[PDB]
Amino acid sequence: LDKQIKEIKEVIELPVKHPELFEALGIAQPKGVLLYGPPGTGKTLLARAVAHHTDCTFIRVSGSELVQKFIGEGARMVRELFVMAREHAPSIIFMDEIDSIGSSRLEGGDSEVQRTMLELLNQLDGFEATKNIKVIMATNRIDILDSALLRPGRIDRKIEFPPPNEEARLDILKIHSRKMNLTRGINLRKIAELMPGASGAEVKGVCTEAGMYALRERRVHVTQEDFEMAVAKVMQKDSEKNMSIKKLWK
Amino acid sequence: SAGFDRHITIFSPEGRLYQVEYAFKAINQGGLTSVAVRGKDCAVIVTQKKVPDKLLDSSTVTHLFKITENIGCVMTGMTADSRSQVQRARYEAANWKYKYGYEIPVDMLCKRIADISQVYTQNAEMRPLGCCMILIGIDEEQGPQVYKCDPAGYYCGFKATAAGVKQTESTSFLEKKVKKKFDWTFEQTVETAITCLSTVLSIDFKPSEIEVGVVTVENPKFRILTEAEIDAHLVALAE
Amino acid sequence: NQYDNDVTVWSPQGRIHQIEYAMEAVKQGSATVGLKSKTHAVLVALKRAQSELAAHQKKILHVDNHIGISIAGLTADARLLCNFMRQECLDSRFVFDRPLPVSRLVSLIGSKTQIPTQRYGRRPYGVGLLIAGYDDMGPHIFQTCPSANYFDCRAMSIGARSQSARTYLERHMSEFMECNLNELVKHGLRALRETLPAEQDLTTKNVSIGIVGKDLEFTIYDDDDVSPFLEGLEERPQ
Amino acid sequence: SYDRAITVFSPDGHLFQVEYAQEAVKKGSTAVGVRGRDIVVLGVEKKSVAKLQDERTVRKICALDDNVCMAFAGLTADARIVINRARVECQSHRLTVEDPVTVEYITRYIASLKQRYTQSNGRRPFGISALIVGFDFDGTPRLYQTDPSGTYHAWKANAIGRGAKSVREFLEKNYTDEAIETDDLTIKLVIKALLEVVQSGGKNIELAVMRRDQSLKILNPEEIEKYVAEIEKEKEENE
Amino acid sequence: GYSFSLTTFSPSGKLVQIEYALAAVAGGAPSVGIKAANGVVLATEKKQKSILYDERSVHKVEPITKHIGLVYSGMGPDYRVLVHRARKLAQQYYLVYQEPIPTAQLVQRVASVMQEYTQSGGVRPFGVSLLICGWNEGRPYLFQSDPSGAYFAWKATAHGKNYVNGKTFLEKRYNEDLELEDAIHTAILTLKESFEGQMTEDNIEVGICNEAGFRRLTPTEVKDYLAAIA
Amino acid sequence: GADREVQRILLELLNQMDGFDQNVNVKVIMATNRADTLDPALLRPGRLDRKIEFPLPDRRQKRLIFSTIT
Amino acid sequence: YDRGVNTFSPEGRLFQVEYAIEAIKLGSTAIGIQTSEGVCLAVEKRITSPLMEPSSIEKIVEIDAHIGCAMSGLIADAKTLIDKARVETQNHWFTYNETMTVESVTQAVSNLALQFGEEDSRPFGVALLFGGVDEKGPQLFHMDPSGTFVQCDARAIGSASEGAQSSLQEVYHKSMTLKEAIKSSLIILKQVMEEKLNATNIELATVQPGQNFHMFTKEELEEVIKDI
Amino acid sequence: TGYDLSASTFSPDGRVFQVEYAMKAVENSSTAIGIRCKDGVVFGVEKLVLSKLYEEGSNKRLFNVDRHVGMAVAGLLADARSLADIAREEASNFRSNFGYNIPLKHLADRVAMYVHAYTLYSAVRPFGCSFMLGSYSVNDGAQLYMIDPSGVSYGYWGCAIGKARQAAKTEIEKLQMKEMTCRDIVKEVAKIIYIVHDEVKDKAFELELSWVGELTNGRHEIVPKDIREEAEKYAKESLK
Amino acid sequence: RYDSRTTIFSPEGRLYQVEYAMEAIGHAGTCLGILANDGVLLAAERRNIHKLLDEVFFSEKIYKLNEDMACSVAGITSDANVLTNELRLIAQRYLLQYQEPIPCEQLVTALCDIKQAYTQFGGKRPFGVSLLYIGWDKHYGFQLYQSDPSGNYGGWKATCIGNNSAAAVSMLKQDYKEGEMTLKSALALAIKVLNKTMDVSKLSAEKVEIATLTRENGKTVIRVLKQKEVEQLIKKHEEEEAKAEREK
Ligand SMILES: Nc1ncnc2c1ncn2[C@@H]1O[C@H](COP(=O)(O)OP(=O)(O)O)[C@@H](O)[C@H]1O
């Protein structure tokens, strides 16, 4: 995520770590960033690491947590979450799968969904006490989201998280294998090449499955063959077949 | 669960036609069983005649019907749906008889009836008919046929079958009869059917409580057995 | 309610509440009275006023030299049914030069009104009708309802505030059979006045009358014509 | 009873789906037409020709008569549908009627077609509005506007689309009650608005002119830029 | 979801009801179709749920023409409808052109039919997927037609229960140079590999297209390949 | 709303399945009658350790169950 | 009970057509007066911008040389109803050569209006006044989406119908000259409806029995303007 | 509620619970009974009076099917009128086509199909009525058939419909209709109707009788009870 | 509900269902028509991926309407098949009337009007098919046209639809070539765009289906490319990327 990580360092870290420029520039600091990509592409990981380096506090609420079963509850949750963030010094607010409460609602109950997304937009728009307060949003497959939050005065930037490529697969396999007992004769590059279009999370999966193959055999070490049969379990996309593979949604 | 069963032309997430199985319930119609057996030169159907009240005329409450001098039909289902289905059977039999010059084969007639039931199954215009019909016939020098025809639009020929209140018991009893090697006479076939009905139902079976239709190669006329014949068979199996 | 959107849907009560709602729509219309004698059959309608400078709406229609109607319902449905009776009487006179018997006309009305009551997406005809006629078999007063039911009544009243008029007609039914035209028409006018509130009474504005007899073509008397019938009739004391 | 439909009314009584059609018109680009002393001129904006998108093909201006001309602002599919219908109607009227077409009749035709299409269940209204300019007003110019409600009105000068709020006021500011002498002056006036609406880029002014006796006339971008330069000289006077 | 109606798109542009039709497919009886070098073999399962059902009285492999064979994985009645339609369409092609209809043309016509059942608001598509084996101008053809109205070219494929097992099996154990007998052997092998329960003359039925003619193997031949072989 | 909410339920289950923090030894156990359904996100290798198939008892097994209970 | 006219309320009323009456209410106001001298109609244009041709909005029309009309409501299909009225007069007169009674013209328009649940759409959400003269009497008539229709002496429909109707009722009597009726109606329109009279938003059309020509008021308002 | 909303979908426990609602509507109506004597068929019906407003002998519920076919109904009255119309149409069709009078089995089965087919289609509803048809064929026998809202047609020696199905059947079961003839059958029918709630709670009603018998010529007529009112006297003697 | 039926707009006036149709298009196998002169081409790599798929037509993405007219597919399969057949009948109608080859824009209109007429009626589903046309006619000769589900049509010298459509059109705009950009350069640019848009390294010949129109003898010829030329073109682009590396 080096390109993505650099963009998010800029937009988040610079106002928090070096506000003076934005004072000298006079411009108000940017408020937040939306993160979009296929599920499992390190979005929460990136937000968590950014919060850790920036030394400010991490507060999380998934969009699905906002809904609730009663009217006037999402608004209360959002407002008191902003109160918590403000009370918690410099802080980044993280909201996973925000699309769950931001989507096509003009179809038409649904009332509280709007009364929640509008309330969140009101909290961020009024730049309420935004002295070192930032928000981070995460979405799977941006398209389902709506522009009401992306409108220029509102949240400012978007970052794309495409599925990891060969080099990214190399990193992620290395990082999640760093703790596992690996053996000479391993060829991890063949493994990364053999896993086209991974989402990153399933590479944590392939490491997990190679280790499970070691464990169920009571072996505390992993080899090339273990990972190679692991990847077979990690395919799981062979369950496509005739249905819609080349017809309809070809 | 709710939603894929409110209308007929809807596939479930697993692809299940809910309304087809749902119409399959009305086939129960507690009171009839329609056991049909094929023997070396005969085809026999017997249905259970559950009359709730005495004042009804016994002839009107019959459930066996004919569409050909050599074809017999029996019914298990909602009585009105029953009579509509057999009337469509008359319609098709008459049209085939006019068009081809000779009466419809039983396999083709089951095919036509199942075809119409499938037609109402595939299209939401009309409810599928909640009834199951069974046909007995003869085909030239080749054999007697027993055919079951269902609202799903499915149909098949059998050594024997029974769509009735004691479904699995009757079917397993007939399998047990056929999974042991034996011959098949007219009286032996009727005996197998009557023993099935009596054993699965466990009732003492006075004559008026059942109705028997039959066809036989030596006398290919479709006949409804008179009370005397059915009581003779009852005492034959009783002793 | 779950089972009250269309007449095609039965209720667990063994009822069709939409037909009853059509009955209530009929009850929304103003009261009308019908009564017959051995000499004449008369119907009278309470013409609802709209303002002091607008015509009081017509509620008695003429379709045949021996047949008349008084309506209580949505005016469109009643008047197009009136066109339907126009068609049938005209084609009957075409076919065999016969003034169409009232009973068979009313039966045809019921049969045609029955069709919407058993089909989806088509409103049953939300009007109640009183039909007056004289024919080769007798004098005739019928009532028809959106349930397609049709009845023969020696006296009848349909519409809002009708209960008092129906009771008055029940009392004077013992009279009407041998009553003369003048007696019958004045009793019908009083039957209508029974419906009204205390401050509302018979006047040329609110009253319309239609008469059929063994010696006169069914005629509707309105405005000036109503004046001689009301004059000489007893006023209302408190 | 909320809107949720085309043929139902909210308790207020207004058809909100017609409102949705007029907003669908509102999301379209600018379109401002006028009539002059003798001539009628038009210039469309927002070409936004993106490289391989050769601007000619989309045909922002269509002339469908021996002499009449307009496209439709909104969604262009219904625009081309009404284009085909206008072709058929104008040619058929010219063939069948003792005298050729007039602008009033064809505008009434478009309005009636839109109304008739709207007035039914399961039939989407044309969410398109248009400005029609024609010559045979007894040899005089006149301009009409058509609205998805199936409505037709007459204008001396009208604007619809993204500039409807702005350009109309512009017209209310400066449409001279003096009949426009030197109809090229009217062309300069309308080009001013047609440019100023879209950022006065000078690239999307795509323009047609008809002197109420002529056939279709078109203005190339350089010749339109001539009027643009004259308008710039007029605007530079404030010094 | 967007499944109670067929004539409306989902926000992701997915016709959901037809994928429910495809889910109805592969829930039915297993079937496998393979193109050999010379012939085309379609095998299907015909176990009777009880000894009551007469295995010699019903068939699932059907000759649409003397050079076309059809096999299916779905509920029977819809397959009967489409068999009737395909037979009439082939006969009408014969009447129009005075030529026996080639495999591809009949396949695209049946696909167009299955298409015309994919619209409107008061009907449903057929819940059946079809293998068409044919001979045309000396060339053998195998085609698959599916409820969406589309069709695919296969040298080998399978559907029904355990169909993914069939895809894997024909991926491993297949080459286009197969002789006819080895092709039928592969067909019964994949049928068993997808199958659960015993297999004999009464349990399986197969149909072979050869350029001279197509024919449905008798139960005895289905046993000869089925038993004492493999 | 029922459909959206059930989808949010399964997604929230997914986030909790991946979310529980290390050194906590909880085990999520899953029961199902069919398992030809079930979205391929529980079968993902990073969440599924073993898939154990519980058939209707056959001979031998039925004998064992009868003996044990009786 | 919201999908259409084919559903009845617990009180019987159809919850579709009352909305059509309220659709009358959203339209421009319209007035009509019946006098023994002549029958007159008035209408407000609501000219959105004077850059429009004020005559373009056909809120005042002539069905025929003896009969004129005004309407209030959605307007769009009101023109269709005027078309039906004109075809009715054309056909009936060309066939029978007897003049169409304005009562009969309104009856034919009503017969058209009864085509939303009575055969095999939606009610025409607009109301109309007709003013006509005939060999038996000069009359004015009123029409509403339900298809019912009534003879009236002084009628008002559209927006602000109630107040204009009250004033019109108070000024009316049975022996007025058409000049006094016109002046009273115009001053009422000025006080309650919009503003002082001008040629680009008000319209008047009047008809007399012996006059089959110029059933309109046009390019002569100046005398009123100085002498209203 | 479930899936019992129209008569084209099998509701849970496949019985539709719709045509059963039509039967519930049938139960609301007053009783009609029908007997077959040794050589004839008789029908006896009670009908409510609207009020003293009502004209005597109006909206009566006996109906003529054919010159020799008689009708008795219960349930929705107007649906019964429409059923009488279509039954007359069917009888006329057979009369015109075959050239001789229709056997009542065929006509009854065709009307049963009409009712049944009306039960299916989604745009329509099952009939809210059930009815008996009676006739005599001098060539071979007498005939009676009863039909429910579902379309089920059966024959009876004695049958009853209305608000007193089973009670009326208990009343009928102990008659000697096995050999008894119609002339006292009318008296027995009138007294049986008066036995089951003549005017106990419902104030007043009208009693109508229909007859088809060889002694009646085998045609359909309304029994002249004006003759000495013997059945009326017997039914009012039923007091105790 | 608004988006449940095709006849309902948004309160903003938009139509959701056609938008859903273009989102559906977003799935389709990547296919483009390239910018070229004195010739045209419409490359369409087949998204079908299984070694046991037989591709017996050698063409499932390009359909020849006439020897001077060809069209592609990007969307629903059965809808596309019936629509291409209908293209053939409409072209047959025009030819059988006039005995003259149809102009490109006229056929494009006729189809798009038919599609719009299907969409705007109720009880019917909009066609989820976007498609491209290459053709030569008397009025304008070489032409490439775009069409969407709503019945819209446009003229494009080079365009692409399917997966990564935005990326393909954007890079076509980045390395835009004009004028001397004849047919062979268009084949090279199509190779470049197919290599960039697809994830496959060393793009395989069977994955791609290519067609081109060239005016032979004034009678015109439309070729669907075989294996050999495809292999040559892709290998040449690989070694061209190697050459681009040689500059380093
Ligand atoms: N580039 C990466 N390096 C290391 N781990 C990763 C990477 N991408 C994803 N992961 C693992 O996969 C998970 C991705 O979660 P996330 O992408 O936030 O899911 P969602 O898309 O549902 O928000 C992380 O918890 C992390 O452990």
Task: Give the DSSP per-residue string, D151-206.
Answer: EEEEESEEEESTTHHHHHHHHHHH--SS--SSTHHHHHHHHHHHHHHTTT-SS---
Subunits with 3+ C-beta pairs closer than 8 A to B: E, H
Separation in Å, CA of E27 to nearest CA in chain B: 8
How many CB atoms sit inside 10 A of residue I238's CB?
15
CA dist., res. E140 & res. C3, Å (int): 60
What residue type is B54 in one-letter code?
A: K
CATH of the domain at D51: 3.60.20.10
- Which ranges constitute the DSSP H helices of chain C? 17-28, 75-96, 102-114, 163-176, 181-195, 226-230
User: C123 φ, ψ to 5°?
Assistant: -70, 135
CATH of the domain at H196: 3.60.20.10
What residue type is E185 in one-letter code?
A: H
> Do residues B104 and B79 lie in contact, with contact meaning Cβ atoms separated by under 8 Å?
no
Residues spanned by the domain of G174: 2-228
Residue nearest atom 6 in ligand 1 by C-alpha distance: A42
Compute CA distances G111 → C117, E61, G116, whole Å.
Answer: 23, 63, 11
Q: Tell whether A38 is in a known binding site.
A: yes
- Rounded to the nearest 10 degrees, the angle between the axes of helix C102-114 and helix H77-98 is 100
Q: Strand order of the sheet with strand C127-135? A: C60-64, C67-73, C127-135, C138-144, C150-152
The DSSP output letter for A142 is: G
Q: Which DSSP string do the residues of E129-151 spell out, in sequence order?
A: EEEEEEEETTEEEEEEE-TTS-E
Compute CA distances I24 → F3, G127, G136, whole Å.
Answer: 22, 47, 70
Strands, DSSP E only, in chain G?
Answer: 30-34, 39-44, 60-64, 67-73, 126-132, 139-143, 149-151, 154-157, 202-207
Q: Which DSSP string do the residues of H87-146 spell out, in sequence order?
A: HHHHHHHHHHHHSSPPPHHHHHHHHHHHHHHHHH-TTB---SEEEEEEEEETTTEEEEEE
> Do residues I182 and D80 lie in contact, with contact meaning Cβ atoms separated by under 8 Å?
no
Tell me whether strands I31-33 and C32-36 are parallel, antiparallel or unpaired: unpaired
CA dist., res. C132 & res. C152, Å (int): 10
CA dist., res. C179 & res. C170, Å (int): 15
Q: How far apart are the CA of A105 and the centre of ligand 1, in A?
A: 29
Strand partners, E209: E40, E214
CA dist., res. B214 & res. B207, Å (int): 16
Strands, DSSP E only, in E109-203?
Answer: 128-136, 139-145, 151-153, 156-159
> Do residues H129 and H73 lie in contact, with contact meaning Cβ atoms separated by under 8 Å?
yes
Torsion sign across C-alpha atoms I84, I85, I88, I89: negative
Q: Which residue has the tokens 């037909």?
A: C19
> Do residues A73 and A119 lie in contact, with contact meaning Cβ atoms separated by under 8 Å?
no
How many CB atoms sit inside 10 A of residue D35's CB?
26
CA dist., res. A77 & res. A61, Å (int): 10
> Do residues E30 and E171 lie in contact, with contact meaning Cβ atoms separated by under 8 Å?
no
Q: Which residue has the tokens 């019945």?
A: I151
Give chain I positions within 8 Å (CB) of A247.
Answer: 77-78
How many CB atoms sit inside 10 A of residue D113's CB?
18
Contact state of C75 with G118 under an 8 Å Cβ cutoff: no
Residue of H201, H221, H189, H197 lying closest to H66 (CA atoms) = H221
SS3 H21: helix
CA dist., res. H182 & res. H213, Å (int): 8
Tell me whether strands C138-144 and C127-135 are parallel, antiparallel or unpaired: antiparallel
CA dist., res. B111 & res. B90, Å (int): 14
CA angle E15, E18, E21 (to 5 degrees): 155
| Encoded tokens for B166 | 């004691």
Compute CA distances D56 → B203, D52, G227, whole Å.
Answer: 89, 11, 60
SS3 E207: strand
What residue type is C232 in one-letter code?
A: G
What residue type is B184 in one-letter code?
A: W
Compute CA distances I160 → B49, C69, I164, I210, I237, whole Å.
Answer: 73, 73, 9, 14, 19
SS3 B229: helix
Give chain I positions within 8 Å (CB) of D78.
Answer: 116, 120
Compute CA distances A162 → A140, A190, I26, I174, I198, whole Å.
Answer: 11, 21, 16, 21, 14
Give chain D positions within 8 Å (CB) of I9.
Answer: 17, 20-21, 23-24, 124, 127
CA atoms within 13 A on the CB side of G189: 28
Buried residues in I56-91 as b, exposed as e (16+ CB within 10 A): beebbbbbbbbebbbbbbbbbbbbbbbbbeebbebb
> Do residues H131 and H72 lie in contact, with contact meaning Cβ atoms separated by under 8 Å?
yes
The DSSP output letter for G190 is: I
Residue A38 alpha carbon, nearest atom of ligand 1: 21
- Residue B132 host element (H or E): strand B131-139
Strand partners, G207: G39
What residue type is H1 in one-letter code?
A: T
Strand partners, C207: C46
Structural domain count, chain I: 1
> Do residues B182 and B195 lie in contact, with contact meaning Cβ atoms separated by under 8 Å?
no
Give chain I positions within 8 Å (CB) of E153.
Answer: 53-57
The residue count of chain F comes to 70
CA dist., res. I246 & res. H166, Å (int): 103
SS3 B155: strand
Give chain I positions within 8 Å (CB) of D162.
Answer: none
Identify from H122, H125, H165, H206 which residue to disrupt to test chain C contact, counting C C-beta atoms within 10 A and taking the largest count: H125
How many CB atoms sit inside 10 A of residue A141's CB?
12
Strand partners, C216: C213
CA dist., res. D36 & res. D217, Å (int): 15
How many CB atoms sit inside 10 A of residue E97's CB?
10
Which residue in C has a C-alpha nearest to residue G147's C-alpha? C76
CA dist., res. A116 & res. D149, Å (int): 36
CA dist., res. G143 & res. G157, Å (int): 10
Subunits with 3+ C-beta pairs closer than 8 A to F: A
How many CB atoms sit inside 10 A of residue G132's CB?
27
Q: What was the experiment behind these coordinates?
A: cryo-EM
CA dist., res. H185 & res. H234, Å (int): 12
Residues with CB under 6 A from ligand 1: A 1, 39-45, 96, 138, 140, 172, 175, 200-201, 204
CA atoms within 13 A on the CB side of D78: 27
Buried residues in G202-217 as b, exposed as e (16+ CB within 10 A): bbbbbbbbeeeeebeb
CA angle F18, F24, F30 (to 5 degrees): 55
Q: Which DSSP string do the residues of chain F spell out, in sequence order?
A: -HHHHHHHHHHHHHHHHHHSPTT---------S--SSS-TTTSSTTT-------PPP-TTHHHHHHHHH-
Strands, DSSP E only, in I50-109?
Answer: 63-66, 69-71, 74-75
- Largest CA-CA distance found in chain C, in angstroms, rounded: 56
E160: region left, alpha or beta (phi > 0 left; psi from -120 to 50 alpha): left
| Encoded tokens for A42 | 């390190």
Q: Which residue has the tokens 């009854």?
A: H108
Resolution to 1 decimal place, in Å: 3.6
- Residue I230 host element (H or E): helix I227-246
Torsion sign across C-alpha atoms I154, I160, I162, I164: negative
SS3 E154: strand
CATH of the domain at G58: 3.60.20.10
Residue of I64, I60, I69 lying closest to I31 (CA atoms) = I60
B33: region left, alpha or beta (phi > 0 left; psi from -120 to 50 alpha): alpha
CA dist., res. D235 & res. D229, Å (int): 10
Subunits with 3+ C-beta pairs closer than 8 A to E: A, B, I
Residue nearest atom 11 in ligand 1 by C-alpha distance: A201
Q: Which residues contact C20 (CB under 8 A, 6 or more apart)?
A: none
Residue of C183, C219, C182 lying closest to C66 (CA atoms) = C219
Tell me whether strands A32-37 and A157-160 are parallel, antiparallel or unpaired: parallel
> Do residues G185 and G168 lie in contact, with contact meaning Cβ atoms separated by under 8 Å?
yes
CATH of the domain at B143: 3.60.20.10
Contact state of I14 with D24 under an 8 Å Cβ cutoff: yes
Torsion sign across C-alpha atoms A215, A220, A226, A232: positive
SS3 B73: strand
Residue of G124, G126, G161 lying closest to G32 (CA atoms) = G161
| Encoded tokens for G151 | 């003879």
CA dist., res. A30 & res. G167, Å (int): 63
CA dist., res. I232 & res. I126, Å (int): 40
CA dist., res. D40 & res. H94, Å (int): 75
Nearest to G76 among D2, D120, D150 (CB): D150
**Among C residues 137-196, those touching chain H with beta carbons less than 8 Å apart:** 141, 147-157, 166, 169-171, 173
Structural domain count, chain H: 1
> Do residues I140 and I105 lie in contact, with contact meaning Cβ atoms separated by under 8 Å?
yes
- Rounded to the nearest 10 degrees, the angle between the axes of helix H104-120 and helix H77-98 is 130
How many CB atoms sit inside 10 A of residue I97's CB?
9
CA dist., res. G123 & res. G21, Å (int): 10
Residues spanned by the domain of B92: 1-239
Residue of C48, C58, C52, C54 lying closest to G32 (CA atoms) = C54
| Encoded tokens for D59 | 């045909």
Contact state of G76 with D7 under an 8 Å Cβ cutoff: no
Residues spanned by the domain of I191: 1-246
E144: region left, alpha or beta (phi > 0 left; psi from -120 to 50 alpha): beta
| Encoded tokens for A36 | 């979009």
Compute CA distances D123 → G114, G124, H175, I117, whole Å.
Answer: 21, 18, 66, 10
Residue of C210, C232, C234, C235 lying closest to C221 (CA atoms) = C210
> Do residues D198 and D45 lie in contact, with contact meaning Cβ atoms separated by under 8 Å?
yes
Q: Strand order of the sheet with strand G39-44? A: G154-157, G30-34, G39-44, G202-207
> Do residues D154 and D146 lie in contact, with contact meaning Cβ atoms separated by under 8 Å?
no
How large is the C-alpha radius of gyration of chain B?
18
How many CB atoms sit inside 10 A of residue D41's CB?
29
Structural domain count, chain G: 1
SS3 C37: coil
Residue of D178, D195, D183 lying closest to D231 (CA atoms) = D195
Compute CA distances E73 → A154, A250, C237, E42, E130, whole Å.
Answer: 54, 22, 90, 12, 7
Structural domain count, chain B: 1
CA dist., res. D151 & res. D129, Å (int): 9
Strand partners, B71: B137
Residues spanned by the domain of D110: 1-239
Q: Which residue has the tokens 């007294």?
A: H191
The DSSP output letter for B43 is: E
| Encoded tokens for H91 | 């009888």
CA dist., res. A33 & res. A42, Å (int): 15
Give residue H170's Cα distance to chain centre. Answer: 17
How large is the C-alpha radius of gyration of chain I?
19
Identify from I4, I48, I52 which residue to disrupt to test chain E contact, counting E C-beta atoms within 10 A and taking the largest count: I52
- Which ranges constitute the DSSP H helices of D57-152? 76-96, 103-118
> Do residues G201 and G44 lie in contact, with contact meaning Cβ atoms separated by under 8 Å?
yes
CA dist., res. G90 & res. H215, Å (int): 68
Structural domain count, chain C: 1
CA atoms within 13 A on the CB side of E38: 12
User: H57 φ, ψ to 5°?
Assistant: 65, 35
- Residue I196 host element (H or E): helix I183-197
CA dist., res. E30 & res. E72, Å (int): 9
CA dist., res. G86 & res. D99, Å (int): 22
Strand partners, H73: H131
| Encoded tokens for I39 | 């010739």
The DSSP output letter for B8 is: S
CA dist., res. E55 & res. E33, Å (int): 21
B48: region left, alpha or beta (phi > 0 left; psi from -120 to 50 alpha): beta
CA dist., res. B185 & res. B38, Å (int): 9
CA dist., res. E9 & res. E5, Å (int): 9
